[PDB]
Amino acid sequence: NQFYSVEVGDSTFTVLKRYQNLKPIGSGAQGIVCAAYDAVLDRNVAIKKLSRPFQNQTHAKRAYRELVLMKCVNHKNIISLLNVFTPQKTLEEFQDVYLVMELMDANLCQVIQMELDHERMSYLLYQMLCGIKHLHSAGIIHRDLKPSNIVVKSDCTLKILDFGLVTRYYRAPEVILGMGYKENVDIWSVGCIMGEMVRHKILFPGRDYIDQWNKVIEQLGTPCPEFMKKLQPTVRNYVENRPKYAGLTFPKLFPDSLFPADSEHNKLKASQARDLLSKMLVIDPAKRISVDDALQHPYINVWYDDEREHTIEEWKELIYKEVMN
Ligand SMILES: CSc1nc(C)c(-c2ccnc(Nc3ccc(N4CCOCC4)cc3)c2)[nH]1
């Protein structure tokens, strides 16, 4: 037989025999991930199992989305699919999907923990922005970018793992407050990651939505009252009739002591970094920098040179065909 089974975490991966020595390298909600040796191609791969894609609408829609976009999207800063398979032989038996992609060497959480280096941070942020730009050009606004869905090779090449849409640490104010969004929603998430590379602390932790919002305004200040008028009626009473917070300036939010010091080079880079932070970490999306302007920012520019609803049966059929195709 062409398949074999191996126990992975709490579950069972059933894979083609080309894929050998499966070891877990991570998990997300969407499914669990193994490194493996692909003996046919003679290289290492990452293998993700989708168990309950067609269990319910939510799971099926996202599985179908992930599968179709991973096949249709080709960009250096988006993870590439190498193979797709199911061990089941017919539609009736069909249960699981396995996605095989290129293996990276670390998550962004690990790189965030390393000492601050301008050329690395600049490069990582350029690549993230390149990836985001390309998704937006294809009509995909991510809305869920976070360190745990970004991976990197040891040479600092960066790859976004997924196409997006609790712990809402990286989500933009407009999304948390449910107030409609545009492309620059993803810029907030980049700003949260950039600040975290500098501070080595999650910028905006929170027990829940309320405290999450509190922590943003604590730091950035309560926004201009024009912003609140766009809030659904009760969200608005909360925000509007809370206490006015004067936040902190960007030099106070990210002091000189966090950055390389005592050369003009490092002095320039520190203020470019803080300048970029101050344009991304902006509560009101109408004042937040765009993807294109961020690519042109002097800290970054050194690197230039459907939704329709289905039944369960139908989602299963659509997914199956996408796999078999
Ligand atoms: C939701 S998490 C996730 N999903 C996928 C599809 C991946 C993925 C995709 C491609 N490559 C990797 N390479 C990779 C990432 C990290 C590590 N580390 C090894 C030590 O322990 C901490 C992580 C090892 C290898 C991971 N990650």
| CATH code where residue 81 lies | 3.30.200.20
The HSE-up count of residue 149 (CA atoms within 13 Å, CB side) is: 21
Catalytic residue from among 10, 96, 117, 144:
144
**Residues 205 and 229 both lie in one domain:** yes
Tell me if residue 155 is catalytic.
no
Exposure b/e, 10-32, CB count within 10 A at least 16 = b: eeebbbbebbeebeebeeeebbb
Please tell me whether residues 36 and 101 are part of one structural domain: yes
Same domain, residue pair 233 and 278: yes
Cross-strand partners of 102: 45
Conformational region of residue 57, where left means phi above 0, alpha means psi within -120 to 50, and beta covers everything else: alpha
My answer on whether 35 and 110 are in the same domain is no
Instruction: Tell me which of 90, 105, 120 is where a domain ends.
Output: 105
The CA 299 to ligand 1 mean position distance, Å, reads 28
Pocket residue to mutate for ligand 1, from 19, 33, 152, most atoms within 8 A of Cβ: 33
Residue whose CA is closest, atom 17 of ligand 1?
A: 106
Residue nearest to atom 8 of ligand 1 (CA): 46
How many residues can be counted in the chain? 325
List the domain range (segments joined by +) for residue 45.
3-105
Technique employed here was X-ray
Q: What is the resolution of this structure in A?
A: 2.1
The reply to whether 215 sits in an annotated binding site is no
Number of H helices, E strands in the chain: 11, 10
Q: Is residue 310 in some structural domain?
A: no
Region label for 26, one of left (φ > 0), alpha (ψ between -120 and 50) or beta (otherwise): left
Ligand 1 pocket residue status of 99, Cβ below 6 Å: no
What single-letter amino acid sits at 72?
C
Q: Is the residue at 314 inside a domain?
A: no
Q: How far apart are CA 57 and CA 48, in angstroms?
A: 20
160 CB near ligand 1 (under 6 Å)? no
Tell me whether residue 80 is annotated as binding.
Answer: no
Has residue 320 been placed in a domain?
Answer: no
Q: Name the nearest CA neighbour of 172 among 154, 192, 155, 202.
A: 192
Among 44, 72, 105, residue at a domain's last position: 105
Q: How far is CA 271 from CA 17, 86, 91, 286, 296, in A?
A: 53, 51, 58, 23, 16
Q: Identify whether 313 is part of a domain.
A: no
Domain presence at residue 192 = yes
Q: Residue 102 — φ and ψ, nearest 5°?
A: -60, 145
Of ligand 1's atoms, which has the minimum distance to the CA of residue 31?
1
C-alpha 106/C-alpha 151 separation (Å) is 6
Closest CA to 135 of 91, 179, 77: 77
Regarding whether 203 and 241 lie in a shared domain, the answer is yes
- Indicate if 29 and 139 belong to the same structural domain: no
180 is in an annotated binding site: no
Ligand 1 mean position to 31 CA, how many Å? 12
172 and 288 assigned to the same domain: yes
Classify residue 315: in a domain, yes or no. Answer: no
Geometric angle at alpha carbon 183, from 304 and 156, rounded to 5°? 40
Q: Are residues 10 and 74 in the same domain?
A: yes
Which amino acid is located at 1 in the chain? N
The answer on 181 and 288 residing in a single domain is yes
Please check if 30 is assigned to a binding site. Answer: yes
Residues 210, 98 share a domain: no
Same domain, 100 and 161: no
311 assigned to some structural domain? no
What CATH number is given to the structural domain containing 275?
Answer: 1.10.510.10
Q: Is residue 122 part of a domain?
A: yes
Q: How many domains does the chain have?
A: 2
Residues 112 and 97 in one domain: no
